[PDB]
Every structure is written in structure tokens, then in C-alpha cells.
Amino acid sequence: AEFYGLPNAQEFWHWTNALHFVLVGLAGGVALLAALLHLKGDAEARRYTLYALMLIALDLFILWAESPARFRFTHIWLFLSFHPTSPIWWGAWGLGLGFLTGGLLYLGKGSQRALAWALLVFSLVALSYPGLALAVNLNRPLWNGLMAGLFPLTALVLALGLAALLKSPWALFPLRVLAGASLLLALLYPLTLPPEARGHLLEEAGFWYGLFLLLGLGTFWQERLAPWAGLLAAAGLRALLVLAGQWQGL
Amino acid sequence: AEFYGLPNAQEFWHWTNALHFVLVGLAGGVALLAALLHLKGDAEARRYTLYALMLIALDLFILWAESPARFRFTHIWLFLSFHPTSPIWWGAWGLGLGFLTGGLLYLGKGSQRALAWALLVFSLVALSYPGLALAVNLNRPLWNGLMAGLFPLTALVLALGLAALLKSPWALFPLRVLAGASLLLALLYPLTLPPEARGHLLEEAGFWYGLFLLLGLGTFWQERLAPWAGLLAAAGLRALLVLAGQWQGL
Amino acid sequence: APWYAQEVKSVYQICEGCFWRCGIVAHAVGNRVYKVEGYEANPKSRGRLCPRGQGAPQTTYDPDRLKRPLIRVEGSQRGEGKYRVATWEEALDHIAKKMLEIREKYGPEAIAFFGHGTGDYWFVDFLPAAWGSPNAAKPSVSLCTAPREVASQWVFGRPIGGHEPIDWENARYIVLIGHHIGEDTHNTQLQDFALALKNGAKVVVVDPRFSTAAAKAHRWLPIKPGTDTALLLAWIHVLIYEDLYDKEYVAKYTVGFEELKAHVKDFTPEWAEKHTEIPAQVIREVAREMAAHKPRAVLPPTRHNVWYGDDTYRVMALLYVNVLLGNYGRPGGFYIAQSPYLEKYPLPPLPLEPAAGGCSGPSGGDHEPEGFKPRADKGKFFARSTAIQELIEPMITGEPYPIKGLFAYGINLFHSIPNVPRTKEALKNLDLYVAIDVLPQEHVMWADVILPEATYLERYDDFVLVAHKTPFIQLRTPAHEPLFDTKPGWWIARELGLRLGLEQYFPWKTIEEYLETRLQSLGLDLETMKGMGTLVQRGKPWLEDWEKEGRLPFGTASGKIELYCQRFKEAGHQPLPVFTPPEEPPEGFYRLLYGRSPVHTFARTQNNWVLMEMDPENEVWIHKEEAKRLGLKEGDYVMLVNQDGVKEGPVRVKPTARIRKDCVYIVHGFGHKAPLMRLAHGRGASDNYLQTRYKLDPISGGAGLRVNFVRLEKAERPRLPSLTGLAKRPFDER
Amino acid sequence: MPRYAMAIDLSLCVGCAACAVACKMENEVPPGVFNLWIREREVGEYPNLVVEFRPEQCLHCENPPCVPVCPTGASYQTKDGLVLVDPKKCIACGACIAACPYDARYLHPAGYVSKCTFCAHRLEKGKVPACVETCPTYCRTFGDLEDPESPVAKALKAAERVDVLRPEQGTRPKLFYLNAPSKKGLTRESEVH
Amino acid sequence: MPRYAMAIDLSLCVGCAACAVACKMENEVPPGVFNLWIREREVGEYPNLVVEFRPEQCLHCENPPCVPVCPTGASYQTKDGLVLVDPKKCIACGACIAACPYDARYLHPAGYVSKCTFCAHRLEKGKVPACVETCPTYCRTFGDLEDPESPVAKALKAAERVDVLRPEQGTRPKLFYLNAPSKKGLTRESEVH
Ligand SMILES: Nc1nc2c(c(=O)[nH]1)N[C@H]1C(S)=C(S)[C@@H](COP(=O)(O)OP(=O)(O)OC[C@H]3O[C@@H](n4cnc5c(=O)[nH]c(N)nc54)[C@H](O)[C@@H]3O)O[C@H]1N2
Ligand SMILES: Nc1nc2c(c(=O)[nH]1)N[C@H]1C(S)=C(S)[C@@H](COP(=O)(O)OP(=O)(O)OC[C@H]3O[C@@H](n4cnc5c(=O)[nH]c(N)nc54)[C@H](O)[C@@H]3O)O[C@H]1N2
Numbered sequence A, B: 001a002e003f004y005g006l007p008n009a010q011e012f013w014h015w016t017n018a019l020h021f022v023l024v025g026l027a028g029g030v031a032l033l034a035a036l037l038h039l040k041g042d043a044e045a046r047r048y049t050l051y052a053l054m055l056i057a058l059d060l061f062i063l064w065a066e067s068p069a070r071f072r073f074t075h076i077w078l079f080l081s082f083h084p085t086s087p088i089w090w091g092a093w094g095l096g097l098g099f100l101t102g103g104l105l106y107l108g109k110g111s112q113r114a115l116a117w118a119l120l121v122f123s124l125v126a127l128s129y130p131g132l133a134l135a136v137n138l139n140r141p142l143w144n145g146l147m148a149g150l151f152p153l154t155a156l157v158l159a160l161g162l163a164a165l166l167k168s169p170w171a172l173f174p175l176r177v178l179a180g181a182s183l184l185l186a187l188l189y190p191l192t193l194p195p196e197a198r199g200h201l202l203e204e205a206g207f208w209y210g211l212f213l214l215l216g217l218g219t220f221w222q223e224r225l226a227p228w229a230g231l232l233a234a235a236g237l238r239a240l241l242v243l244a245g246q247w248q249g250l
Numbered sequence C: 001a002p003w004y005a006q007e008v009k010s011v012y013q014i015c016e017g018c019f020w021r022c023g024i025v026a027h028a029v030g031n032r033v034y035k036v037e038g039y040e041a042n043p044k045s046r047g048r049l050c051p052r053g054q055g056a057p058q059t060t061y062d063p064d065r066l067k068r069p070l071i072r073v074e075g076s077q078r079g080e081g082k083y084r085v086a087t088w089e090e091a092l093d094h095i096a097k098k099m100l101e102i103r104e105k106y107g108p109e110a111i112a113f114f115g116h117g118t119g120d121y122w123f124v125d126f127l128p129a130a131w132g133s134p135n136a137a138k139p140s141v142s143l144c145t146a147p148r149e150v151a152s153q154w155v156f157g158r159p160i161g162g163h164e165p166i167d168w169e170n171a172r173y174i175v176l177i178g179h180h181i182g183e184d185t186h187n188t189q190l191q192d193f194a195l196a197l198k199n200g201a202k203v204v205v206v207d208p209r210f211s212t213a214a215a216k217a218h219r220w221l222p223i224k225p226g227t228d229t230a231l232l233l234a235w236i237h238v239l240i241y242e243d244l245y246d247k248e249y250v251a252k253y254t255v256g257f258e259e260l261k262a263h264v265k266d267f268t269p270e271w272a273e274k275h276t277e278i279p280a281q282v283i284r285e286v287a288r289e290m291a292a293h294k295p296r297a298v299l300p301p302t303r304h305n306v307w308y309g310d311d312t313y314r315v316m317a318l319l320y321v322n323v324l325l326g327n328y329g330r331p332g333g334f335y336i337a338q339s340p341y342l343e344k345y346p347l348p349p350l351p352l353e354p355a356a357g358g359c360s361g362p363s364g365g366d367h368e369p370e371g372f373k374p375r376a377d378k379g380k381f382f383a384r385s386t387a388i389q390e391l392i393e394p395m396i397t398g399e400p401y402p403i404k405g406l407f408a409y410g411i412n413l414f415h416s417i418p419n420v421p422r423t424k425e426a427l428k429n430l431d432l433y434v435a436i437d438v439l440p441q442e443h444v445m446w447a448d449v450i451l452p453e454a455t456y457l458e459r460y461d462d463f464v465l466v467a468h469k470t471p472f473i474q475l476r477t478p479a480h481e482p483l484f485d486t487k488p489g490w491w492i493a494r495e496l497g498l499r500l501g502l503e504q505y506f507p508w509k510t511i512e513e514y515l516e517t518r519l520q521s522l523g524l525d526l527e528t529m530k531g532m533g534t535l536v537q538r539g540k541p542w543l544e545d546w547e548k549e550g551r552l553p554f555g556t557a558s559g560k561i562e563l564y565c566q567r568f569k570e571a572g573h574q575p576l577p578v579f580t581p582p583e584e585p586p587e588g589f590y591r592l593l594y595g596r597s598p599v600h601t602f603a604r605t606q607n608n609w610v611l612m613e614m615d616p617e618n619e620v621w622i623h624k625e626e627a628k629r630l631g632l633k634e635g636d637y638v639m640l641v642n643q644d645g646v647k648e649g650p651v652r653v654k655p656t657a658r659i660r661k662d663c664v665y666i667v668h669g670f671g672h673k674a675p676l677m678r679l680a681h682g683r684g685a686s687d688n689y690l691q692t693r694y695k696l697d698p699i700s701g702g703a704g705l706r707v708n709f710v711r712l713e714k715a716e717r718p719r720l721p722s723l724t725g726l727a728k729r730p731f732d733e734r
Numbered sequence D, E: 001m002p003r004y005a006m007a008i009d010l011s012l013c014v015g016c017a018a019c020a021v022a023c024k025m026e027n028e029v030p031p032g033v034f035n036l037w038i039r040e041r042e043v044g045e046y047p048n049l050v051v052e053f054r055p056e057q058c059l060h061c062e063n064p065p066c067v068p069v070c071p072t073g074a075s076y077q078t079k080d081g082l083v084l085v086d087p088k089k090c091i092a093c094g095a096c097i098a099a100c101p102y103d104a105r106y107l108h109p110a111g112y113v114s115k116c117t118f119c120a121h122r123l124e125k126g127k128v129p130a131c132v133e134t135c136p137t138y139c140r141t142f143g144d145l146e147d148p149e150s151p152v153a154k155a156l157k158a159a160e161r162v163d164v165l166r167p168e169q170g171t172r173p174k175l176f177y178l179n180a181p182s183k184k185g186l187t188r189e190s191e192v193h
């Protein structure tokens, strides 16, 4: 209760790493739309493959931009070591090989639709890694097992929300299906925590939490409210869980 | 290491109950289908309501036929008290009221959209309570937070898989979206566990688990294998987590 | 539904759980004792009870418990299990008729009487002498306590007794040699040991195994087996040569202390460490520490002492150390135990009377010209106690005359006497073999006539007298009447006694008649005795109380420290030089050590569902590194094969270290081959079936058991019935 | 008004299941189940060999996870700190078994769930529990935690160390272990192999 | 090949912060961050007041959650049991800070993660850490756990009790608190509120 000096219990991932969390949701989700649109033969497979390349690249820039290690150029090691136990490592390659693969697909060469299978795999790695980068830390009570489920569900709500605003006919229905799955797990999450972890969550966020749950109920009303309301709900929850879970707490 | 007598650490939920677990998934998810159908004003809303009623009846019958207190007639207390903190209490009231609500819908009595929204809410209570009946036991390392995510999504793969065998046209696409979600979260599940618990899941199960993960992949292949494969993966996964997670273990 | 909400009837009752005989209250509701409890005034239980005492009542409500007399179908072999129900009248006639025939062509000494438990007074002490056979014995003498009783009779003039006289509450330093307290679960001594620990009593344990008592010790000396006398001699040497002993005490109460100092000249902590394997510094430190605490430092003598053939020497040496510390009769470790006064029931002297020997000719003087035929083991060892294991040979060869006919009153022939094959040959050759018991054990079903005894809760027994700081008398009253066709042992004895001309012995027509006579003597009657279950009398415990009166206790007027002028003379040696290096296990083998499970009594509790459910099997203790070289792990099973090829049913392996690499350990009493005791049948390994050989103590009739070696052979897990299934069979008093 | 508890001295416990058998008898606990059992574990090699004997049974947790999870209201916590079951409401759903972190409860064959009762039947008539009365070593103590005179209160006051099983669940057990034999505390299966 | 460890005898720690200041001077740890800090907590009420002075720092866990989590490989565990950071490969992502259960890790203002180092720089020249060196109360010891002549080894042997922070986690902390002042062990915030 009293200290000489202080434990390094200060926030470590700030509002900027909460912003990247939201974009890699999009980047991975859209890369999934793209490969599926390929595999399916759809005329739109190209439009969505060059978007995913921008979203992926925007994120990888925000990832280096927000790193205090940027002008020390140490990221080359992210690609010169084998580290399968590391969620973040898996996301470096998943977004890196996912980029090349999406390049060799947009420049119609190298190979076709055997390459959409590789894009599908790399997009699943990119959709999976954040969720596990949090849940892997078993010392953080709030970042429980549900993060591994709440993040991939929420990244597809982001990708389908975007897709539906760029008026693609197919996007609304699956966005309202994954948004229902997303919102129901988000409601059950608090009931899954131990009492002190939940109490911490409701005093720190919550309103904010119960706001984004309410806001998300807007995907099931009108259009041009729908993709917006589900999009703000998915990014709300994503950013708030990264911000409120950096607690170690007893 | 050695005992005089023994701790009561034996399986408390049998193959019998695991069956109840697969069934309440079906029951709840078909009651969601009937609710959403009445809500679109679609013609099939009537027989889906009969089915959700049948599966609700079949599930309450085996919840009672498998109870050691089946002839002591004490289930009446489930209904004469208020226990909001208990998943099984929520489950009893959701199904129960969901069976009256769906009873009046079938008999065109006591209103009809206001009864379809009710069926919607009670079918969300029934889809939600199983994963929480597991997940609230923070002493059991395998029943972590993801159980609150794995159980609702898997109950949907069961209902939609059934709807598609009955040849309803709308469902073979949602079945593939929801089966992709369920299999992705099911694959990341073991990676969400402390080492010793993952090692325990792998020793005791897995090979069954890994077989259920492969199986479910056939939901994206041949048209009429797709619902069987999706049904068996979702039911195998639910029963395996129920039997393998009854461990306190240090 | 609960028993305590239902109407109850209590009674003051003794526990027959084991021979400690704790005073208990039994709570019955109708014909069934639901609960039993210790009681405060009783000096043994004082309100508490061990596990065996608590579970002891279920044998009375065991569906396999013996109910009717039975006689062996004519023409069927003993062993084969063919019987036909009989009447008490018919079975009792058949026994007397047969007994009388053996007596007309052989004499009455051709009938051996083996027995144990409370009613052994009738079968082993009374009936045999009233009938005229000196061949009466109990396993608690040559298979337990003989070495120390003999050592004690020679050194002090007293026994150590059934309630060993240790003043635990004032003890300050305690040395346990093989004495496992906490596994050996005798009530009061558990209580006392626990109270000593509690008050800051530091305990040293000497044992090749890290036992429960060692788990509570300040020092554990992992001694090489069969080597304790070298450690005792070297401690005797340190207290004499470093001049730490109690000088006065030896000067006023000790004879021949000088012979001991010279004997022990070369037995130094360095000579000891060589055989003992305990470092010489440790040997020294332990003797100094105990000298620093006198007279409140004690080496209490253990109860089971047959370990090796030399045994009386080890105990003598342990007693010298206690004497040298000045603790006997002083508060610290030995109070002086006097027997209570309850006058015997008036009767004519018995044809044969006993000789509680110790000095000046207690061997065979009365056995040579004195009337007609001495106990059949008369020339085999020095001491005068009857040895159960030596009178078995006479039944096979007819050597020392012939013993046809044998009685087994509650004594496990196949688990308590070594060399089971030899005992079976001996039953083969008998003309009559009767067994009085409750359960259908493997040795009861080899009998011509089985008589079902009534259990301790459905029975009255002659009083239980306990020599103690404050001597006392206990009385057990039925909690309810016998079940089925069951009869008390006092009744069975009297009924046989009237049939063989012994009416002058057995005159009284009933046990309460008998009990009223002894209560007259003391100043009470039956109803008042039932009122205060136990009776405490005044006695003495120190030396002052004795001394001020101008007397001392002993044997001959001064404890003789080397300890016995008449053995010297005609036997050979007086002192305990027989540290006698022990024969070692052959390579590939281990010494077989054995002991108690806190929850099971000897062998008789293996069919008890309340107790088997706490401990359903034994487990072989091997050092972690040996089980590893062998290819054995945690849940494996194994057969134990002894140096003579005998294999003992599959036992679980227990690779956890708390034992030397020289040894292996298993709890005694498992391995029953008795199909009718449905939950004890086929479980664990029997130590006795592996104890094929034994080294006869030439001084105290004892059969050294720790002389057997065993090796382990990988075996399959056993397939056995479900214990819960069997335990659930309802008890029907028909 | 009291807050009921139990204290067991492990420095004195020798693992003779006396308490376990006394409870079996006093409470008529059927064959395949147990309200009380003893666990025995060794720790270490030759020159530092410790053995821990440990009775385990309902700890009558102050914050019992085994109560909120019950659908009927059969599972309840008393005003003095006893966790009990009203068999009249019990549906034998096993929710309380899933929730107890100590393997303290079982399905009794009569159709309802059972477990250590702190001998409520004896407590009500002013007696001490069966385990507490039959105990050669005098290592268990019982009483009102709030009364400075009660035997548990005294026992805790005189203890060198106090431990509780799985303290990190947050159940607040009311069965205290005194003076554990091992320096590192109560033994766990995880600190083995 | 040895197993490096630190032991702190809390019966002697007075929480003066000498070790903490000796560390800051030696490793020139920058303002605002700490390799080592002291935590002081009272467990209360008059006749029974207890104060725990507890220095905290990297425990150099034997099974460190901060190593596996690193994408770069800059977080490595050494052959003798030191967890160190090679700043050449560090991308300052914080994954290790997220996985550290003890708050022992910080972002150095020079753009890489830092934390106590077991004074690696001194261990190679054959010296004892700076905090161990300055300690006025002689309460902290160090050495190879496997060498029984080690000051850690001898102290662990002499301790009345040995504890570790969050044992329930996977880690196997190699910083041992010896004689904890409160009977219930090391103080926790949940045990207050
Ligand atoms: N191999 C080996 N032998 C030993 C020992 C050992 O450790 N190993 N220990 C030795 C020692 S120390 C002792 S003291 C003795 C004890 O030896 P025993 O007393 O012979 O041992 P138990 O195995 O209990 O056998 C008791 C027999 O009496 C029966 N019985 C029990 N209660 C009653 C009753 O009320 N009435 C009647 N009629 N019968 C009853 C039981 O069914 C069983 O047949 O054994 C000794 N023998
Ligand atoms: N639970 C229970 N308790 C009982 C009984 C029972 O049947 N059940 N029976 C009672 C009776 S009658 C008796 S006789 C006793 C038996 O019990 P004890 O009288 O205590 O027997 P001991 O043979 O002294 O002790 C057994 C210990 O002796 C050890 N030992 C073996 N060889 C040697 C050696 O060479 N040197 C040393 N120092 N130790 C050695 C073994 O390792 C074991 O740890 O217990 C009594 N109490």
C-alpha cells in the first residue's frame, strides 16, 4: 500500500495501440472478404483485394509509427527469427505474407486462385492473432479466453460494415449475423469474470461498455445507420478492452 | 499422492448430460429461427415453431429423465424462486417461458409480434445459459471464458444445419459463416489455456477434438455433406468439452 | 431417518478392535450399534477413539459374518470347503466326544489350545489348564512380545505389560527404535505421544524406513536393518565411558554394573558406525543429548520385537540405557504399574497352574518329574513362555509325543504364524481341529466344526484389569442380544466344560452370577458397575512411594544390570554381545519389512467395508532409484517372490523415497485367499505367506520374521470386484 | 452471530483416519462417498524429508461459490457461517459440485447432494462435531471465530503459520491449517514432477 | 549450468530503500522507472499489528512468461537462469510487459524494454549484485541454488518459511522471500479489500 519508488504498473499500450487494434481488425477482415470473393469467382474480387492491401499497409505503418523503436530499425528481426509461441510474431508474417500474396493476386501474375487459398490462410492468421496477443497473458484477469473469440468476431463486423457502406449487396446480412454473435458474446463477457475483475471493469469502463452494446443494436435498424452503428460498436469494444485490461490486479 | 478414503473428484455430468447439452443447443437455436421467421413474416415460421417446441419438450424430458431426483419431484422449486445468479435457473425460465410463448404463436392466441420478440428474447436466454453453466466455475481450468462464446455459436451451427437438411434455402449460407466462426474459435481454444490444462485437454481428448475440427471443414465442400459434417462437428465439440472439462487439477 | 434422532440406548462397552481394550460407550437404536465413543473417566480412551475403534462395529453387521455352527461333511478333506449346518448341542457333543478319544489313547496334552482376544482367558488360560494341557499359546508372545518380556523379567523384577508404563507427559527427549507411532494406532499412546510433542518433547526415530513417527522427529537415524544392538551397545559405551550416567541411581538400585562397563570397552561409536551406518558423531550426540535430559529421557521399548533371532539382547541393551539414565520409576519415563484388586471367582486350584518365571529355575522343573507331560516346546529355547510356532511341529512328526486335536479361538493360523505350508500339513494330520470365530477366514474353513462367536457388542466378558499409574477395572455389557445363532465365549467354554468333567470349574449358572461375586468383593454389584463402566483404584508409580514404605519392586532386591546369574551358568552368555552381523539379502532381493496401517487391525478388518474403503489394499515401498532401475512406476503392480519361490498376489508399487535401498516394506494382513469374506478376498500381498523361514530366538521363544528376502516381478493390474458394490449389500438379521 | 470455523494443527496430525471414520459413522455417509478424507504427501530427498498428512472436507467457505450457482434455493449459507443443503429443494443438478473447488460434495444415493455439515445436528444441541471429539492427537479445534476464548480462536492465535487451500479462488475458507510441515506451505500436485 | 537466485529475509528487512537507490546509481536507471522498489503494508489492529517491508524486482522466473511472448527473440533466458533483454533486437512492442505478472519491466527512454538484470555485468567479473552489496541489514543473499555453499542456498536452508509472489502463476520465481512477518504469508491487496 505505500512504496519507496514504484512498481512499473503504468499503461503500456496507449490510445495509439488501441487504434492499431481497430485497423488490424479491418485489415484482416477485408483480406478475408477478398480471398473469399476470389475463390468464389466474383467480379468484385479485385476491388476488395486492393483495399485490403491499403488497410494492411496503413496498419503496418501505424505499427512502426507508434513504436518507440522506430528510428532504431529493429523490426527486420520480426522477419529473421522463428518464434511460433508469439501472437505478435504470427501477425507480422500473417500480414506480411498476406501482403505479398495480395500483390501477386492484384498484379494478376505468378499464379491464380491457388493463391486465394494462401490469402485465406494468411487472413485467418491476421484475424486470430490480436485476441490471442491479449489472452496469452494469463496474469491479466480481464483478458480471458473470450478475447480469442471477441476479436475475430469483431474484426469481421468491421470488414462487413465497410463493405456494406461501399454498397456491396452481399454485405448487410452477414454483417447483421456476425454483429448479433459479436454483441451477444460482448454481453456475456462481464458474467464470465471473477467478481473483482468485473467490478474493475464496470467502474473503469462499462457505461462506455453499455453504450457500445446499445449503439451496436443499431445494426438491426434502417440502412446507412446500420453499417455505421455496428462499426462504432465493434471499434468501441475493441479499443476499450485493450485500454481497460492492462490491469494485473489483486 | 496417497489417501484414506478419497476426495469426491469423479465425473458429475455424464454422457447423458452431454446429450442434454447438444440438445438444448438445437432447441434454443431452432427457437431463434422460429422467432426471426415470425419477425420477417415468412411462411415457414409456423412449423419452425412446432420444432422448437418439440426440441424444448425433448430437452426438458431428458433433463428430468436423467435427474437423480426425477421421482422426488423437486423441480417445482426451479419455478417458485428467484435465483438470478444461477445459469441453470436462467435456462429453466428461458426454455419454459419460450415454450409458452411459442405455444401461443402456434395457437394464434395472446397477440403475435409481441410474442415473436418475446420468443426472440427467451431463445437468447436459452442459447446463452449452457456456456455460462460451464464458465462460471472458475475452479475448472478448461471451462474458461471462451465457453460463453463456443456454446452460443455452436447451438446455431446445430439449428441451421438441421434447417438445411429440411431443405430451407436460407441457412446454408449462414450455416457456413457461423460454422467458420465456431471452428476458428475452437481451433484457438487450446491456445487460450495455461500449459498444464492444454496438456490435459490434449492427453484426455484432442485426437477427438482434432477430428471434430477436420470434420467441420466439410461444411465448405460438397453441398449435401455440408450439414452432416457441421452438425457432427458442433455436437462432438459440445459433448467433448462437457466431459473433458470436469477437472480441478493442479 | 438419522440414527441420533431415533430413540437410542447407550451402554458402557470395551472395544474389541484390538488388544488395547479401550473403554467405550456404544449407542444402539434397536438391534444395531450406530456409533461408539470414548469416555472421559476411562484412562484408556479419555473421550477419544482411533479409526479401528470407530469402524469396529460393522463386523457385527457384515452379511458374510458367521451365523450357525457348522460341521465338516464326512469324507471331505480339510481345506476343501464342505460343511453342513448343525445345532449348538450337536456341535458341542461332537467336539467333547472327539476330545475324549484323543485323551484316552494319548492323554490331555495331545490337545493344543491357540487363541487371542478378550475371551482367550477362557480358551487359552482357563479351559486348557482345567483340562490339563500345557500346550496353550497366543501369538502375542512368541510372535510379538516375548523378547522384551523376558529381558524385562531378568533386568527388573517386572513385566513391561499391555499398557506399557511410560510417563510420556513428563518425558523431554524420547528415542524410538522401530516403534512406529501413528501407524501403530493404539489409542492412549497416540494421545500421549501427541501431548509430548505438544509440550516440546523432541523425538529421535531409529528405523530403516521414514515412518509417520519419523515425520514428527527432530532426528531420523536410517539404520542398516538388524543392526540396532550395535547402536545400543555404543550408546551404553558413551554414557559409561564419557561418564554421563546417573551415578546414584546405579549405586542404590543396580546389581552388577561393573560387568557391563568392561564388556562394552571396545564397542565405540566408530565400531558402531561401521555396522550401523549411522555416522559416529551422530551416535555420540544422541547419547549426550539424552544424558543432558535425565531422568526425563526415555527409550520406550517397542511392542513387536521378533525382528531377528537375537532379539532379547537388543531389548536388554535398550533397558540398560534406560537404567543408566536413571529413569525407571521416576517422572520422565517409567511410573511403576500395579495391577488392580478384583478378587478371583472362588474355585478349586487348576490341574496346571502357571509359572510367571524370571529367576532361580523357571524352565522345566515342574515339567520333568512334576506330574505327567511338559509343554511340547520345552527344550527349544531358554525362557519358559509357551511359543505358538514351536508346538506345530509336534503335530506333523509326532516328535515330543503327539498333538492330535487343536483349538483356534480367534487367532489367525494362516496370517499370524509363519510358514503357512507347514501349518497346513499340521492341520492335515490332526484328529480334531476346532475354530471359534466370526468371519469365514481362510483358516476357519479348514476346520472340523466351526463355532460362531458372538461379537463384543452382543456379549458380556469377564472383567478387564489394567496395571497402571492408577490401576483400573473395566466392564463390557451387551448393547443388544446376539444375532442369528450366535453364542458368547464364556457360554461356549462352560458348555464344553460341563461335557468333559469340569463342572467344579464352571459352577456358576450365568455370567452375571459370576460378575456379581467379584463385585461383592470390591463393594459393589452388577447394576452399579454398569453405571461407572470403569473402576480406578489406588496404587503406585515412582520409587519414593515404594521406598518410604521400606520396600523396592523387582525380582531379587536390586535390578541386576548385566541381568541374570542363572543363564550365565548353564546357557553361555550373560551380556548382549550378539550384535551378530545379520545375514544379508542376496543381490536382486530386498529385506521384507512390515507393519501397521492406521486403519486396519492385523488381518481381521479386511472385510470391513467402512475400513476397507479407507484402505483397500497395501502398497510395496521401494526406494525411488530402485523402482527406476527395475522398470517400475507409480501405478504398477508387482508380484513379491521370496528366496524360496513363494509368490504373493499382485501389489501396488510405491516408488516414493522414505526407505533405504536394502529394503522393501508392506503392511501386514492383506493377501487373503478366503472367497467367503467377499471384500477382503484377493487384495494386496500377504507378508506371512512370504515369511517362509524365521530365526528362533534361543532365549525368548520368539520367531524372528525380518529374516526373509523378497524380489519384485512385474505383474498385471488386478481385476477385482467393485468394493462399493459389495459394501452396499444390505445387512439382514433375517 | 458466531462465525463458525475449524482449525487443524498439521504439526500434530498423523493421518490415522480416525476423524474420517467417526464422521462416516456419526453421519451414515453411504459407501462410495466421503465428507472427510486424508491426503498424505512426501516432499523431498534424504536429509530434508517432510511428510504432510492433511484431512480435507467442506471448508464452509465464507464466500461460497457453491451457493449462488444453485437454481432451486437448496444450497444455502446460514447466518453463523454454515454452508448446508435443504434436500427438499435439491434437484441433483450438480451445479454445486461443478462450482466447489475442493471436491467436498457428492450425490447421495437418495437423490440429492450431500457433504460435510459441520455436524449441525450436534451444534444445535450444544455439542462439538464428531471429528473433533474422536481425535487421539487433539489437533482439531472448533468454535466461533469471534469469541477470543473459543478453541479455534486460541489455536489460530498460538499458531506459527496459518494456511488455507486454493486461496486464490476467492472463497475465504473457514477451515484453517496450522503449522504446515513444509517451509513452502501446503503441498500442491503442481509442485510435484 | 548453475541456477542463479536471490533470497530476501523479510524478518530483517526494514525497508530503508538502500538496495533500491544502489541499483539506480549503478545501472543508471533513468527517472520515472525502477528495476527495484519497496512495498510496505500494515496488517492490522493493536495487540496484533504487523508491517511487511517487501522489496520487489525481476524474480528471473524459471519459467518466464515474458520470453515466449517476444516476437523478436530479444527476451531470452540464459543457461544459468537470468532473463535478459538484447536491445538490438527489441522492437519495443510491450508484449513482455503484458505477460510479466510482477510489474518488473519498463520501456527505457532510449526505445527498448529494460528491467533488473541480476547485475549481469558484475556476475561475469565475479562480483555480487549492487543491491546485495549495499544492504545494511544483511537480509539479502545471492548465488547458485545448486551450490550448497552459496549464500542463497544456506539461507533457504535456514529459513523458517519460504514464499514467492503469485505462485499460482506459471513462473517459478527465483527470488525467495524468507521469513514473512504475517502468519498468513505474503500480504495481498485482496486480503485488505
Ligand atoms: N506375519 C506376521 N505375523 C504376525 C504379525 C505381523 O506383523 N506379521 N503381528 C504379530 C502380532 S504383533 C500379533 S499381536 C498377533 C496378532 O494375531 P491375531 O490376533 O491372530 O490376528 P488377527 O489377524 O486379527 O486375527 C484375529 C482372528 O480372530 C478373529 N476374531 C476377531 N474378533 C473375534 C471375537 O470377538 N471372537 C472370536 N472368536 N474371534 C474373533 C478374526 O476373524 C481372525 O480370525 O499376530 C502376530 N503375527
Ligand atoms: N493400526 C494398528 N495399530 C496397532 C496394531 C494393528 O493391528 N493395527 N497392532 C498392535 C500390536 S499388537 C503391535 S505388536 C504393534 C506393532 O507395532 P510396533 O510395535 O510399533 O512394531 P515395530 O516392529 O517396532 O515397528 C515397525 C517399524 O519397525 C521397522 N523396522 C524393521 N526392521 C527394523 C530394524 O532392524 N531396526 C529398526 N530400528 N526398525 C526396524 C519398520 O521399518 C517399521 O517402520 O502395533 C499395535 N497397534
Ligand SMILES: Oc1c(Cl)c(Cl)c(Cl)c(Cl)c1Cl
Pocket (backbone or CB within 6 Å): B020, B063, B067, B078, B088, B091, B092, B133, D091, D092, D093, D094
Ligand atoms: O441446463 C440444465 C441442466 Cl444442465 C440441468 Cl442439470 C438441469 Cl436439472 C436443468 Cl433443469 C437445466 Cl435447464
Ligand SMILES: Oc1c(Cl)c(Cl)c(Cl)c(Cl)c1Cl
Pocket (backbone or CB within 6 Å): A017, A020, A063, A064, A067, A078, A088, A091, A092, E091, E092, E093, E094
Ligand atoms: O501487432 C503489432 C503490435 Cl500490437 C505492435 Cl506494438 C508492433 Cl510494434 C507490431 Cl510490429 C505489431 Cl505487428
Ligand code: SF4
Pocket (backbone or CB within 6 Å): C015, C016, C017, C018, C019, C020, C021, C022, C049, C050, C051, C052, C053, C054, C056, C185, C186, C187, C188, C601
Ligand atoms: S486402540 Fe483403537 S482399535 Fe484398539 S481397542 Fe482402542 S479404539 Fe479399538
Ligand code: SF4
Pocket (backbone or CB within 6 Å): D008, D012, D013, D014, D015, D016, D017, D018, D019, D020, D038, D055, D134, D135, D136, D137, D138, D139, D140
Ligand atoms: S483424527 Fe486426528 S490424526 Fe486422525 S486424521 Fe483426523 S486430525 Fe489427523
Ligand code: SF4
Pocket (backbone or CB within 6 Å): D069, D070, D071, D072, D073, D074, D075, D085, D089, D090, D091, D092, D093, D094, D095, D096, D097, D112, D113
Ligand atoms: S445439486 Fe442440489 S444443491 Fe446443488 S445446485 Fe443443484 S439443486 Fe442446488
Ligand code: SF4
Pocket (backbone or CB within 6 Å): D057, D058, D059, D060, D061, D062, D063, D064, D065, D066, D067, D083, D099, D100, D101, D102, D104, D105, D115, D171
Ligand atoms: S468447501 Fe465446498 S461446500 Fe464448503 S463453501 Fe467451499 S465450495 Fe461450498
Ligand code: SF4
Pocket (backbone or CB within 6 Å): D019, D022, D023, D024, D026, D027, D035, D036, D057, D115, D116, D117, D118, D119, D120, D129, D130, D131, D132
Ligand atoms: S464436522 Fe461433521 S461433517 Fe465434518 S467431518 Fe466432522 S462429523 Fe463429518
Ligand code: SF4
Pocket (backbone or CB within 6 Å): E008, E012, E013, E014, E015, E016, E017, E018, E019, E020, E038, E053, E055, E134, E135, E136, E137, E139, E140
Ligand atoms: S537493503 Fe534490505 S531492508 Fe533495505 S530496501 Fe533492500 S531488502 Fe529492504
Ligand code: SF4
Pocket (backbone or CB within 6 Å): E069, E070, E071, E072, E073, E074, E075, E085, E089, E090, E091, E092, E093, E094, E095, E096, E097, E112, E113
Ligand atoms: S518490447 Fe522488446 S523484449 Fe519486449 S516483447 Fe517486444 S521486442 Fe521482445
Ligand code: SF4
Pocket (backbone or CB within 6 Å): E057, E058, E059, E060, E061, E064, E065, E066, E067, E083, E099, E100, E101, E102, E103, E104, E105, E115, E171
Ligand atoms: S518477473 Fe516478470 S519480467 Fe521478470 S523474468 Fe519473471 S515474467 Fe519476466
Ligand code: SF4
Pocket (backbone or CB within 6 Å): E022, E023, E024, E026, E027, E035, E036, E057, E115, E116, E117, E118, E119, E129, E130, E131, E132
Ligand atoms: S541485482 Fe543489480 S539490477 Fe537487480 S536490483 Fe540488484 S542492483 Fe539492481
Ligand SMILES: [Mo]
Pocket (backbone or CB within 6 Å): C140, C143, C144, C145, C303, C304
Ligand atoms: Mo502384537
